[PDB]
Amino acid sequence: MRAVNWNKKEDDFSLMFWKQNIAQFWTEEEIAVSSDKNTWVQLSKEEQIAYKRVLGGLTLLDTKQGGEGMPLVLVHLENLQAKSVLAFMGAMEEVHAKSYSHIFTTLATEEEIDEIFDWVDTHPLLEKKAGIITSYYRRLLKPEVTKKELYMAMVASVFLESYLFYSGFFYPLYLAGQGKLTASGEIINLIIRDESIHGVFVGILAQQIFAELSAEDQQEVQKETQELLMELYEIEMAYTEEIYTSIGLVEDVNRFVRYNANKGLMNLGLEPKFEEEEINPIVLNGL
């Protein structure tokens, strides 16, 4: 049985991603967020509710990525160096999830926090989107998986990392770009820096597996990937309408969702599917 041997490279990129993961290491103890209270109280109830809801959805996605997406993909990866990288990325998803709780403690009472988590758990669109992604991961709960199964789990993972988070990341960025909730915005920017490299890395792994598939299996997963993108898009457009109508930001968020969907496709080596639109300037300032 083989041990990981970093003296013999298994590929030309895992070491650089291993080093970058670690270089980016952080935890929530490093950024106090109590100073956000002064701008928190300047927001309206509708703005505060939207913020708490999107953070709840982000927490759900990181929970599933650390607890299912990274572990089940990594278990089935043959390359032991890449497996190492994925294990570290999965741990960072748990750091991210804990950091949202750190934000919640400043912005809400204990009872309000538990209400948000009940809202997350019962939410039909969050349940639907998380169910679609995790169905691909749960197919990997078997002793041996096919390359098509592993590829589609990696596609789902890239779509989570590079696309599904972004309807949620929009609002912290938008507020931080206006000087509001800037400490929480700093945390969100650290999370985004991690998710960006997660999506690039899993996308490299997916492209490698795809190229190993038979032509018939390639045609199958190509179609399934395009369908999945648009199945998720219909749900995202319902989610943004629900969350952002009250505060007038629906079309802005939808543009940002499309921009990030295109990045997820490019991380998979695939062509963009949405028209190019320039990033919202306030969001850009929040980044």
| Token digits of residue 110 | 């204990």
Q: How far apart are the first and last CA of the chain?
A: 45
If one asks whether residue 161 binds Fe ion (CB under 5 A), the answer comes out as: yes
d(CA 46, CA 281) in angstroms, rounded, equals 23
3-state secondary structure of 144: coil
Q: Measured between alpha carbons, how far is residue 139 from residues 122, 148, 250 in Å?
A: 24, 11, 34
Q: Are 135 and 127 in contact (CB under 8 A)?
A: no
Q: Count other Cβ atoms within 10 Å, centred on residue 255.
A: 18
166 is catalytic: no
Angle between helices 182-212 and 166-176 (to 10 degrees): 150
Q: What residues contact 94, with CB distance under 8 A and at least 6 apart?
A: 62, 66, 67
**Positions that interact with a second copy (CB under 8 A):** 1-8, 18, 22, 25, 27, 29, 56, 59-60, 62-64, 66-68, 70-72, 74-75, 80, 83-84, 87-88, 90-91, 93-95, 97-98, 101, 104-105, 110, 113-114, 117, 120-121, 126-127, 130-131, 134, 138, 141-143
Kindly tell me which residue out of 64, 129, 180, 198 binds Fe ion, with binding defined by CB under 5 A: 198
Give the annotated binding-site residues for Fe(2+).
62, 93, 96, 161, 195, 198
Among residue numbers 81 through 100, which ones bind Fe ion (CB under 5 A)?
Answer: 93, 96
Shortest Å, Cβ 22 to a second copy:
5
Shortest Å, Cβ 128 to a second copy:
10
Task: Count Cβ atoms within 10 A of the Cβ of residue 76 and give its class: 0-12 exposed, 13-18 middle, 19 or more buried.
Answer: middle
Shortest Å, Cβ 76 to a second copy:
9
Shortest Å, Cβ 29 to a second copy:
8
Nearer to a second copy, 134 or 254 (CB): 134
Nearer to a second copy, 108 or 283 (CB): 108
Q: Which residues are catalytic?
A: 100
Name the site residues for Fe ion (rule: CB under 5 A): 62, 93, 96, 161, 195, 198
